[PDB]
Amino acid sequence: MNIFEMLRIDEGLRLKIYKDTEGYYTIGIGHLLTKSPSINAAKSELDKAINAAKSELDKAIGANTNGVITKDEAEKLFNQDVDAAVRGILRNAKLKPVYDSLDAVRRAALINMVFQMGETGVAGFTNSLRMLQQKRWDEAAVNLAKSRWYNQTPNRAKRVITTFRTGTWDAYKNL
Ligand SMILES: [Cl-]
């Protein structure tokens, strides 16, 4: 098990543009494209938003995909996004310290969070980050669950939290 396999499990793999729970158009292995209008929105705003997402994809891939890519392309974007998440951590003054204080398994859990909610979002878990740096695993676990993150994606959050708690890949084995 490793960060790529871990995120492949949590993000899945879809070769056609779809929208996630946060209402964002996405593709491949959790690659975010653009936000989507209201469910009522407007038949026009809809097509506009779809085209906006499609243009982002062509830009990312460098070709006219029409909203469809291949597995190789999905993995290409995935490699780029995993790298971007790590670099984001290293460049952030609040995240780097925590990341460096963690063992390799828990480092993957942090990358997972940043990959999903972005550098800025995770850097906001001030109290959780302090507990992790202090290696107060159980307290950090309880605190991490008190979040929109946990409430909106409980199954995934539980796997990530358990990883921070145990320092093992037990939550991802047998999946
Ligand atoms: Cl990109």
The H or E element spanning position 148 is helix 148-152
Q: How was this structure determined?
A: X-ray
Report the chain's C-alpha Rg in angstroms: 17
Catalytic residues: 11, 20
Is 32 part of any known ligand binding site? yes
Look up tokens 């199954």; give the residue. 155
Q: Which domains does the chain have, with CATH numbers?
A: 1-175 (1.10.530.40)
Q: Give 26: exposed, middle or buried? Use CB within 10 Å, 0-12, 13-18, 19+.
A: buried
Is 115 part of any known ligand binding site? yes
Is 174 part of any known ligand binding site? no
CA 59 to centroid of ligand 1, rounded, Å = 7
CA 77 to centroid of ligand 1, rounded, Å = 6
> What resolution in angstrom units was achieved for this structure?
2.0
CA 57 to centroid of ligand 1, rounded, Å = 8
